[PDB]
Design a protein around this ligand. Structure first.
Ligand SMILES: CC[C@@H](C)n1ccnc1C(=O)O
Ligand SMILES: [Zn+2]
Ligand SMILES: [Zn+2]
Length: 231
């Protein structure tokens, strides 16, 4: 069973093996009066690991690296943040000090600097236009357009048919919008449709927060965004 926000003390990180060489990482964080789970991805890259997103904070990201060393025992050599928010770049300094090469699009680095969040060192070129995709080792990076944020990327693992949607994709149990302060509500369904059109073969869909599912998380998210738009 997938670890839920109830089973994880703020400060611990769980790993969940989705497929051969693919895991999600799950942390918890307190925010605005509540506790939320948060997902990222780990993808084996030969004898190294590619990390997708921090574990939401320096303390959680330290624990994430410890859990990876304990349960997998391969070095994290590169990390990609999928947008500029704290649940995605909070902990980047921890990764860089541990020798991880940290990456984000110039869009994400720009917005993180404006916001005062941690800034990944390296830039991912070739993702500034909606529908752009670039290979990054064992994953493909995709910019679907503005959704949860203007810079949000999704990540596809071709070998395992795993689509990591990040915060642009909601889990089924979430029936109201989350933090939409930086969102483009008007474009979000269109951006989700680009994901569906580009990855129709996806078998495992991982939202930014909560339980994984299939491609039906995409239509669920569009439904929730439209309902919010209409409120
Ligand atoms: C999922 C709950 C909301 C508040 N949230 C917390 C952190 N990130 C988000 C998001 O919307 O992506
Ligand atoms: Zn966000
Ligand atoms: Zn988020």
């Amino acid at each position: 069973e997938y670890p839920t926000v109830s089973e994880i003390p703020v400060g611990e990180v769980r790993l969940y093996q989705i497929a051969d060489g693919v895991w999600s990482h799950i942390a918890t964080q307190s925010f605005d009066g509540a506790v939320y789970p948060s997902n990222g991805l780990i993808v084996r890259d030969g004898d190294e690991l590619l990390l997708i997103d921090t574990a939401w904070g320096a303390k959680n990201t330290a624990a994430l690296l410890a859990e990876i060393e304990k349960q997998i025992g391969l070095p994290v050599t590169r990390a990609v943040s999928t947008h500029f928010h704290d649940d995605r770049v909070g902990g980047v300094d921890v990764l860089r000090a541990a020798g991880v090469a940290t990456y984000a699009s110039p869009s994400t680095r720009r917005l993180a600097e404006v916001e005062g969040n941690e800034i990944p060192t390296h830039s991912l070129e070739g993702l500034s236009s909606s529908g752009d995709a670039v290979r990054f080792g064992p994953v493909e990076l995709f910019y679907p357009g503005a959704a949860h944020s203007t810079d949000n990327l999704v990540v596809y693992v071709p070998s395992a048919s795993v689509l990591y949607g990040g915060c642009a994709i909601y889990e089924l149990s979430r029936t109201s919008a989350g933090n939409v302060a930086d969102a483009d509500l008007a474009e979000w369904p269109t951006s989700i449709e680009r994901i569906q059109q580009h990855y129709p073969e996806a078998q495992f869909v991982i939202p930014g927060h909560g339980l994984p599912g299939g491609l039906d998380l995409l239509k669920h998210t569009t439904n929730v965004v439209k309902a919010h738009t209409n409120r």
